[PDB]
Every structure is written in structure tokens, then in C-alpha cells.
Symmetry: D3
């Protein structure tokens, strides 16, 4: 009873922003307790070491059943330092990352770490001439809408909820750690949408979101002429804004059919389900 | 000089989700270092105490210049416990909250605390029959878009950047702490928008967002018949979706005039500014 | 039996613009006859007195079963004069007004008057620097769309049609007069919408429309600096435009379900009903 | 000083709905005084005679400088009876009508009557299976938006305002009565729009609005198979809804250029003008 | 058995652009073979004679079962020459045209020619000051969306598929050739739309499209003052852009009901049919 | 002097549909004469050989200055046959294709052929269960809007207008033939858009359009389970519909600035230019 976990956040990913809250949406679950720590947007090896140190430090008394590290590119220097420290700890760990994480997928399975790699969680257009705090927040709002309305966050919610159950049985083995890669095609194996065109619009939203990453990468790391890289990173943000609109359109189709899936948590932690607006969740 | 701060997050508010990130959007500032801790969505007295303890314990070796506590309703039991603990501590502190915080504005002033109260940061429709994880993320995506595109996040960015400069004097007087209340009318004193209709559409979005809170409160704490409260809380979410569309319309108007204000940070922390897309921030 | 009524219009309210027309949409009812008089937009004591005099003078030979006075703020000087004059007359009467009318609800009950107070029928941003004839017509077009597509006009239609039936008994008791207050929550007791999301979008539109009044009041009667009040009244109009877009969205949802409620009058005054587009009203 | 007029309304036209209010938008003009009378939607010869009788009756003491009759089809039996009674009276008169009014244009000039015929003020789809009170109000909201945002109402405002000046000079001759026909091409002789695409979108809105009339006529009077006439009249309403959207798009273009023309009345009655949002009207 | 046909394209009409491709959408039909020839946008007598000569020269060895000539105005000099030449040949022929072709309907029947006249296939705003290559492509994109999404292209597909079945039996008589005039009302008897509001929106789109022709004709052939004709032809294109939006709205309504009609060809030529997205065409 | 060219169309690409018409948009150019021939959508070797044979047979008497072959995938068997045949002839030739043509760029240069490869001209979702004639036309409408409004068609127009000037002097060498590959980045150096956000939205549209091809290819050639490939190809079409919306948004931004570039042909062939709506092209 009452599973515990520590979430570590370094750098920012739409999924890492929301991961812990997706598990206790109304703060009324009594089978879980969480702690969240991090160094904000900084994700260099020095800053990531400090963050895992905090986590490992509080774990001593908190005693988490599992620890989660979430942020961009698990293949980078900083995140790699975190996988190192978590794999060689006494707590099972899961790494939440984006597409670049695929580079170290096998390496993570070798380290005995779990993972949830979200391909559509795309890097933003991080050039100083374009990305100020407001633009970053706008992009994150659009990405958050895409990940939520397409149902990607439900896949994540379900992974952590199943792990939370395995954890209560005090039996968390490596074979229990999730090993997920989420993308457009993930929706084909789900029953998220009652309307077929809502699922197809959600798929198109996820494909565009995944494609945003290549554009941001080109503008931030490849293109060196500012007359070209500023328009390039901005075009990636215009793409995400349309992906958010497709996701919104999909959700509205479910509303027209009074079939919006909702899977809220009960106080005991069980995931309920409902489709009709006035239907009690069971 | 490198300013340091600790952010504590209990419960969720749109402003508390982004507050730290607004200060180092591309993680390239070399004049700041942050630590972020919290108990996720739980904000009861027990959890908030644990949250502030973590922070104060870390504060020992971290030695921050100030501490920020962000979350809903500064007047509630948990947040009140945090105010007392921080007011008692040796660290200058700021409280980020929503409109219910106005109830203790005089009290926080006597406690020697600074505050940033964001009226449009409205409580969501937290009824189990309606609010599942996906719906909560969708609402927050709309609220984030409203607070970003209307310019509210820039007001918050500026307040903390002003405090960070003060901290570089290793002397933050109570007089230096912010005492801000942000709402629709805050825009009248800013020069956020070059186009006046973009300003008034942004004002309309903040008014609608502020008004969402009362609908949410009614459906969550007053109405007891589920046949009435489920529609009531869903109507609050439809309002926030349209507020986000208004904020988007305001920003597209600035785009049509090639007048989108951007204020990115330079590596040394200086806040630059630009309006024209192809112009460098200076 | 042919029921007869006189409508008096002083000042302008969305509900007073349409009230009489809602009762005989195609002018084919043979069970009613109306006379409409007023002083246009002027609603001062002098004009309203003249307005009611015209009505009472016509009433002599016309012999109406009831008289209706519609216009903003039943509590203002002019409207109060009309209430006294009608309360004193021999004709059963109903007062159509907006939210400020709540201030004299007990008084109208003591005056033996009926009333229909429409909270979403909000005062417009009447400042010379902003409100010209075209802007006033645009605002009223949006308000009309909101009151029509959310179902508020059907509530008004039904109240008067019920009174007209009573009048066909040449005996309208004070007990027969309507005593209605319409707002967002009125929809919860109706079966206007087959789709629940159309109902909640309509509720959100009525909430926004109701909230417009406070912004208008602030910009017209409280704020004295033109640099602040012109933006304030324009923001109220942007809010009403989005309320109209929400009401339009609700109706398109009913169209997607081929469930648009239509309740036309038959030649003898009977109110028919239909939902499916190709179905005859019965 | 202080001109007086009586407006008579029988049947409904978007222009007749708004005609008098366009002359005193904030009810603060002190150079005019108006009286409005009518028989609501009924426009048969019996009802129109009664309406003009009311007007002529109150004219005795009110002493209007001119009388206005507004409603659909001045060529119909009812409206023809009104032109008869007004032409043979001692008060100059103006007839406001729609396109069918062109049939009796010369006949009206022979009667010494003035006129303003608005081609885009189209008859609605008045079939019982489709048009209930709510649908009628929705259609009128869309038409009101078209007539207002395209600038048609300004043409009307200007005609009556010029007549109001001639009237104060106590010299209202037939050569002073307006003789206007308004349509899409009317916009080419105006300076309404600063942005050329706003004028072209407004022209397209007026062309569609004018074309709606032929569709309504076919569905109401020609087509007799209900499986065909119900879809036909509804298609006319869908056309008007898009005309309203084009008009809205035009106004938004003026907003993007901060060039929305506003011509408000001063208390003395002079028509002021302004373009920039923060510009005082002169 | 393989049906053979030659298509001749002179000038451009939306239906002539697509006519042949609507018959073998994936190029996998094993029962047809076509040749397409033309003189691009030129449609004067010299060019049309050259186009038809090319077709008849090819016909000697190709041995087509029928020949189709498509392009604007069958009554113009160029197209009239094609009609004479085709009428003089041994090959069954069909003329695809626009509304102006109605003028020569009797001539074509006497010439033994079939015809499909598409009234909504409206002439564009062909004035040099407005119509450049890009604008000509944007208009055609909107017109193509209208003709496709309203179902007009399905009527054309059906007519030719019927002729192809007869061609296979070498049994195409003059009485088998189509004599079709397509417009808004054609939609009333199609089984195209499951949702009635989709049909009604599609009808509104075709009505607006048909009306665009009169505007283009006024701006290209009647009005001679450029300050007037440039805005006029531009307004025609704004109308067509809104007609495409209506057609898009109709299709989205069918998607909401998972009822989008699809009628693909099987490899053997059979026209299959389906409505539900996941249902195989049969 | 009159330039002559033959266009061969096999299979369908958005650019091949429009290529010839972009050169004489109003059919009033006195300096060009074209012949167009093809086998409709069929592009297998047998059909392509027949199309090219038709062209070369016509060429003997027509004496074209250059020949253009346009259609999907220059590397496929059919198109490869056209390349061989055209490379073997005396007539300067240009191949218009899509991204798959990049594979044979070296072959074409060795063949002495020019080429214009349009990467955003994406293959559609050609599965029988989804693509019927109507869906194929809707997709092409969206693709045409993208290629036109983003300015891609202006690049094609310019390339051919340059070749036409050389054709007039009978001076078309192999080095004069284009070698162009068009994509999102092509827009960075065009002087197409006055507003920078219009350029950025246009770039986002071309990026999404280019990405549609990979989705269509996955659903048509890789995925073999219908429960998966039908949703996949449908998602490609939803992407293209949003790319057209972005292109539409870019054009509306240019309209807001009265800066829509237009480059019409004069009767003598000269390419004129204008930006302001009421400015004559020069
Ligand atoms: Mg024959
Ligand atoms: Mg034969
Ligand atoms: Mg014959
Ligand atoms: Mg036969
Ligand atoms: Mg050669
Ligand atoms: Mg040669
Ligand atoms: Mg060679
Ligand atoms: Mg040369």
C-alpha cells in the first residue's frame, strides 16, 4: 500500500513537465506519495549529478520504490551521467526522453534501466534571436496539447500506473520496468478514439510533432547563416502550432460523438473509465 | 556573480509550472543556478512541510539568495504552513499564487514575504467525473498559452530578473521583494503590444481566464448535484479554451505587424529586446 | 380567441429587440395581434413617460390582454417611472430587463408586475471614443447570436406563449405573470441540446456574456482616464465576439448530430417541435 | 434645433431593425427626438394601415419633420398602402426596403417619397419546417453583422443624418429626400476601408447576402416539394452565415492595420470621425 | 474488354482539369486506356482546330469508343469549331462546359453531341492587374475543392463510368450520350451526404460558386474603369475561397458521423462503395 | 517571335497539372504556343512510350523549341523510358518530378536533360480502401493551394519564362536547362513575402507537404495490414489539408499588409510585377 517514487527533472520535455501530475490529477490518491527534484532547464553533467545526488539523498529516508529521471536526450553527457548513477543504485529507475534517446536504447537495457521515449516530444527552436521565455512557453503549450489530446499522455499514465501496482507487491524486477517507444503508430494499437477520423487527425498531429525535431535541429546545430536559421526555427514552431490544432480538432470530433474517453484515478488508485459525458466513471 | 534560488512546487498553478524556466529559456545563463523541489500535486500541510524541509535542508550548502514557493491558494492550510516556515527562515522569500491569495496579502506583508498573485491563473474543474489526467493537461495547455501570449509571463520574468540583479548584491531587503497582483488591467501599464486590438484581445482573454475560477469553484465546492456540477466544471474548461484562442489571435495580430516582442536573456543574464523578426535582440 | 399585447421599447437590450418577433416568426399566427411603441434608444424619465403614455392611449381602443416594457436596467429612473405607470394601470404587465434589474425584483413583485431578467444581455461599451453606430450594431449582432443559439430566446418565447394562452381566458392573474431570471445555469434545467458538449459550450458563452457587463460598467462608469477606459470597453466587445463564436460552435455540434431543436408556431399559435432536419414539426 | 421623426416598422428587415438606433447610438444626442411605432412582423394592408394611423395620430402633437416607414417589399399590398397614406400627408416620408422595392422605384419618386433600398437585406428562409424563432434570430444576427461590418449601416446613418440637418433648416423639400439603392458596388464609391482586401471581402459578403434572397424566394414561393424546399431555405441561411464571416474577416483586417473607421455622434449631433484606436474622434 | 477514349482540353475549367483522372484514380484500372491532347489555355478557333486535328489523327490508330472535349464556353468561337468537327466525325462525343454552354444546348443535341454543363465551374477574375499564375492556381485549388467535396465530381464520374460500360460493348448510341446540367439543386437527389447539414452546406457552396461567374463576367467584360474592375474580380475570388470552406465544412460533418462516401474503382472497373472508414469498399 | 513547346503528362503530380498554364494564365500571350499530350494517370512503360511517341510525331510539324515531361518519380520504369527517348532526340527537354527523382539526378545530367524536382509535391495515399476519385481531387486541391500560395509555382514560372526567352533566339543549350530541386529552404532566398511570418508559415507548409510523402509511401508500399495502412494513408491527407491552411494563413498575412506579390504576363510575354492591390503591374 502507498507506493513511493522520486522524479528528477533536468532540462525540459513536454512529457517530463507532466509525468508526475498525470498520476494524481486531483491530488486525492492515497496509494502514492511523490517527491520531485531537479536543476530546472540546466542539464549539463555537473547539474545532473547534483540533481541525482538530491534524489539519492532524500531516498535514504523517503525510501522510493522507483526513481524517474526525465529530460531531453538521454544520450547527452548530462543524462548519461544520470543513467550511470541510477543503474548502479538500489532503486529501480526509468528514463523518460525524446527521439535521440533511441541511440542509447540497448545501452539502457544493458544498464537494467526502464525507459519511455516519446518521439513526438520535439526539441524546440532554441536560437536566441527567436526563443525568449514567452515563445518557449507558447511552444510548450502547443506540445502539451498535442501530447494530451492525441492520447500520448494516457500511454504514459498507464505505464507508470502499472508499475505502481507491481511496486505495491514489493516485487519490482527489471522485467517490470517499462520499455516504451511512443510515436504516431502507437495510436494504431489503442482504443483511444471512437471516431476514426479523430484517430487519423491525432496520428497526423503526432507525425508533424515528430518532424518538428528535425527542423529545430537543423536551425540550432547545422545552419549557420542567421538569415536562414531564424526563419528555420520559427517554421518549426508554426508546425507545432498546427499539430496542436489537429489534436484539438480530433478531441472535438470525440465531443460531437459524446465519446471522449476519460480515465480518472479513484482515491485508492484504481483507474476508472467512461465515455459518455454524463456517465459515472467505473 | 552567480545568483542562486530554490523553487518549491506543491499543487499546480500555470505560473508555478513555468516560473523557473522563464528565467533561463535556453539554459545558457551563467549568472544563475536553481534547485527545484516539491511534492507534485499534493499540497496538504504534511506534504508542504516536507517540501519546505527538503528546500531548507538543501539551502544549507546551496546557499540561495532567495526561495520561491509556488502553488494554488496562499491562504489554504498547506500554503499557510509554507509561508510561516519561510517567513521564519533566514532566506528572503516570494510566494507565487492565484486570486484566493488576495485574502492574505496583508498577512504576507507582515510576514516579510514577497508575492506575485496571478488572478487569471484559474483553478481547474477538478471533479472526478470530468477531470482525468488528459483533461488536466489540456486545460493547463490552454492556460499556459493564455499566460504566455497575453504577456503575463513576461511580467513574472521581469520581476524575478529584477530580484536576481538585487541578489547579486548579496543583500535582498524586504523592500526588494515583489508585491504584485496581475490581472487584465495589468496590460494597460505595459507596452507589450504594438497593435492596440492585440492588446484588447489579450485583455479579454485574461478577463475570461480570471472568470473561469468562479465557475470552477461553484462546480467543485458549492453545487452538490452531479447532474449540474459536471456540466458546470466542463463549461469552465470550454471558457479557458476560448481564452487561449483569443490570446492566439492577439499574437497573430502582432505577427501581421511584424511586431512580436521578444526579450531573450544573454549568457550573462542581461535581458535583450527585439520587435522585428529579422532584427537581432539588443 | 385572439390575444393582444403592446410592447414598449425604450433604450436597447438584445431581448427587447427580438421579444415580439419571437412570438410570430413568419407572421402567420392568427391568434395574436401586437402593437409596438417606444422612444428608440432614449430611456430618460421624460421619454419613458411619453412612451408609456402612447401605449396607454393606444390601449384604450386596442384593448390588450397585457403590456410589456423592455429595456435596460429596471432600476434606473426612466424604467422605474414605467414600472409605476404600468403597476398603476389596469393592464397586467411584464418587465424585460438585464441583471441590474435584480436590485428591484422584490419591488416589482410588490408592484404586481411580472419580469424576465436576462443576465447575459450585457450593457455594451458605450464610450464615444469607441462606440459608433457600426460598432453598436456589431455588438448587438454578436449578442443576438449568443441569446439565440444558446437557447435563451426559446426560454423567453415559451414564457410569453404561456401567458398568451392564459390571456385567451381573458383573465391574467398576477399569479400568471412570469417571474424569471435567466443565466448560464438556466440551461441545466432545459433539454435544449441533445449533445452535452453543445450544452456546456452554450453555458460557457452565457457566462462570458454575463461577465461582459462588469467590464462595460467599469469602462463607462468607473474608469476616468481615456487611456484606460477605451481599451477596457473594447475588451468587453472582444469578449462578446468570442461568446458568439462559442454559441455558433454549440449549434454546429447539434448539426453534426442532426439534432437541432426547432419549435415553430402553427397558424393557430400551437408550438410544434422537431429535431431531425427532414422531419416535419409536430 | 432638435429635429423630430417617427419611424414605422411593419414586418422585419435588418435595416429597419437598426435604422433609428444608428442615429443615436449612446442616447446622448440633443438635436433629435424620435418615436417608433409598428405592428411587429405583421405587414398586411390592415395591419399597415393601423400602423400609419398610429404614426399620423401622434404626429399631430409630436410634429415630426419627417416620417420613416421601414420593412420588406415596398411593392407588396401592405407597404403600398403605407406609401399611399404617407405621400398624401403633410410630412415628408422615406421608405426603407429591400431589392423587391426596385419594382416601384419610379412610382415612389412620382409619389414624392424618399427611399433607401438595401439589396443585401435579404428575405430569410421562411418555411415552417425550418424557420422557428431561434433560427430567425440567428439569421438576423448574421445579416446585422454583414450590414454593419461592410459599412452599409454607415451609408444609411449618413443619409438620415444629412436629412436631419436639412430638417433643422425647416426646409425639407422633395429634392432633399434620399433616393438610394445600396449594393455590393456601393462600397466602390466609399472610403470605408483602409485595407483593399477588407473592402474586397466586404464586397463579397454583400454579393452573397444579395444572392441569398433568390434562394429564399425559390424555397418559399417556387419549389413545392418539401424534400427540396426545406434544404433550399436552409442553404440560404448557411450562405448568410458565411457572408457574416467574410464581413468579420474584413473588420479584422482593419484592426490589424489599426484603421477601423468610427463615426460617432457628438451631443450636438455632429458626426465625428477617427481611424486609430487611441485617436480622439473629431 | 478495354474501353478507349480521347480527351481534348482547350482553355481551363475545373471539371476539364480533372475529368479523365476521376475515371482511374490510382491508375490500376485494367479496363480503360486514354489519350489526352490539347493546346493548354488557348481556346481560339485556330488553336482548337489544331487540338481537334491532333485528336482525330490519333483516333485513326487508337480507335477510341468516344471523344470528350472539355473547356470553357461551348458557345464561343473556338469551342464551336470543336463542336462542328466532332459532330462531323464518326466518333460519339461529349462536351464538358460551364453555364454559358446552355446557349447552345439545342445546337449540340442537333449535332448529336452529349454534354455535361457544370454551372458552378465559374470563370475566374481574369484581369491582368489581379490574375497572375499564382492567383490562377489558388482559385483553381478552391474550385477543385468545391467540385470534389460537394459531390459534383462524383456525378461526372458516374456519367462517364456508365458510358465506359457501353463503350465496352461498342453500343454507344446518341441517346446514350449524357445531357446533364449540374447545379446546386442537383445535390437534392444524390445519395451523397448522410448528414443533412452537410448537404445544405454543399448546396450553399455550389450556389456561391455559380454566382462567382456573374461577378467575374462583370469585372472582365462590362466594367471598364480599373479602380472598379480590379476590386470586382478580386471579390469573386474571395467568394470562391468561402465556397471551398463551406465544402470543407460539409466534408468534416460527414467525418464526424463516420459516413464519408467513397466510390473507388476495382481493377476490373467496377465502381465499389463504402461509408464507414474501416469498411472495405464493395 | 513565338516560342513553342510540347508538354507530356503521364501520372499526376501537382506541378505537372499546372506547369503549362502557369506560363499563360489568361491565354493572352502572343509569344508562345503549346501542345499538351499524355496518357492521363497511367505511367507504365507502355503508356509512357505511347505518350512520348505522340509528342515526337507532333514535333515533326510543330517544331518545338523544347519538350517537358512531367509526372511522378523520374526513376520509375515508365518515366525512365521517357527519359531515354527524350535524351535520344534533338529536342532540348526538361523533366518535372518529385523527390524520388533525386535518385537519377546524375543520369539525367548525363542524358543532357534539365529537371525541376519538387520535394513537397508528395505522393497521395493511394490505397483503394481510402482513395476514390473525390478524395484524389480533394488532396490535389490542397496540394495545389500549398504549391501556389507558398510561391513554389512562381519558381517554376520563372524557370520556364527564362527558357522561353532563350527559345525565342533558338539558343537553348544543355547548360541553359534547369537543374532545380525545390523544398522548404528554397523559400529563404525568394523575394516572395513581405511579412516574415508569412514566409515562415509557408516554409512550415512545405515541410509538412514534403513529410506527407513518407507517410503515403509507408501506407502504400510497406504496411500490409489494412487495419493499419488505411489509417496511415488517411493521416497523410489530414497533414496535407493542414499544410494548405498554413499556406492560406501566409497569403492572408500578405493581404493584411497589402503586399501580395503578383507577377502577371504582358501580351508580349514580359513578366510584370506589383505588390499593392491598386498598383498597376510593371
Ligand atoms: Mg455519331
Ligand atoms: Mg463506330
Ligand atoms: Mg445527326
Ligand atoms: Mg444500349
Ligand atoms: Mg540536345
Ligand atoms: Mg535544334
Ligand atoms: Mg549528351
Ligand atoms: Mg546563351
Amino acid at each position: 500500500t502507498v507506493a513511493k517514487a522520486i522524479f528528477i527533472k533536468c532540462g525540459n520535455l513536454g512529457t517530463s513537465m507532466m509525468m508526475d501530475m498525470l498520476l494524481d490529477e486531483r491530488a486525492d490518491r492515497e496509494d502514492v506519495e511523490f517527491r520531485v527534484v531537479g536543476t530546472s532547464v540546466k542539464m549539463d553533467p555537473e547539474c545532473v549529478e547534483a540533481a541525482v545526488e538530491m534524489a539519492l539523498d532524500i531516498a535514504e529516508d523517503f525510501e522510493p520504490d522507483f526513481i524517474v529521471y526525465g529530460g531531453p536526450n538521454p544520450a547527452a553527457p548530462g543524462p548519461s551521467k544520470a543513467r550511470e548513477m541510477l543503474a548502479d543504485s538500489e532503486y529501480p529507475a526509468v528514463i523518460i526522453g525524446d527521439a535521440p534517446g533511441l541511440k542509447v536504447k540497448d545501452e539502457m537495457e544493458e544498464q537494467g534501466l526502464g525507459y519511455i521515449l516519446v518521439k513526438p516530444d520535439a526539441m524546440l527552436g532554441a536560437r536566441r534571436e527567436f526563443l525568449d521565455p514567452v515563445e518557449m512557453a507558447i511552444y510548450n503549450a502547443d506540445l502539451m496539447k498535442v501530447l494530451a489530446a492525441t492520447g500520448v499522455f494516457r500511454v504514459v499514465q498507464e505505464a507508470f500506473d502499472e508499475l505502481i501496482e507491481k511496486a505495491k507487491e514489493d516485487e519490482i524486477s527489471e522485467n517490470d520496468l517499462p520499455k516504451l517507444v511512443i510515436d504516431r503508430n502507437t495510436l494504431l494499437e489503442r482504443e483511444e478514439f471512437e471516431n476514426p477520423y479523430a484517430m487519423v487527425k491525432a496520428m497526423a498531429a503526432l507525425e508533424i510533432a515528430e518532424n518538428v525535431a528535425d527542423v529545430s535541429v537543423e536551425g540550432c546545430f547545422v545552419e549557420q547563416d542567421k538569415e536562414r536559421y531564424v526563419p528555420i526555427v520559427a517554421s518549426a514552431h508554426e508546425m507545432m502550432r498546427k499539430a496542436a490544432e489537429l489534436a484539438d480538432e480530433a478531441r472535438e470530433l470525440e465531443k460531437s460523438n459524446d465519446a471522449v474517453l476519460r480515465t480518472p484515478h479513484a482515491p485508492d488508485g484504481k483507474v476508472l473509465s467512461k465515455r459518455k459525458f454524463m456517465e459515472d466513471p467505473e
